Design a protein around this nucleic acid. Sequence first.
RNA 1: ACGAGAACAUACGUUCUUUGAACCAAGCUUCAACUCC
Length: 51
Amino acid sequence: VFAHLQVSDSETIDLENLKVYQKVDYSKTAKPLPLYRECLKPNTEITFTVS
RNA sequence: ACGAGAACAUACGUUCUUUGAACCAAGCUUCAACUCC
């Protein structure tokens, strides 16, 4: 199947769709973790093409 | 006091002329920078 499913690269999105987040894990309390990752902002439009 | 005695099978002469190791052929396929504290 996946020799025919061709995916392409995204558009190079702007530098204002990024915001640094801090991850949290949850079983009985929302425990902070010392890991920081610059994720994407919500409602960010990302354009591809797929064939 | 030999069908004998003398007498170079020798001289000159390009293994040479013409000719693509070519032709056809994707370094490619499946592949998450992710996982757990």
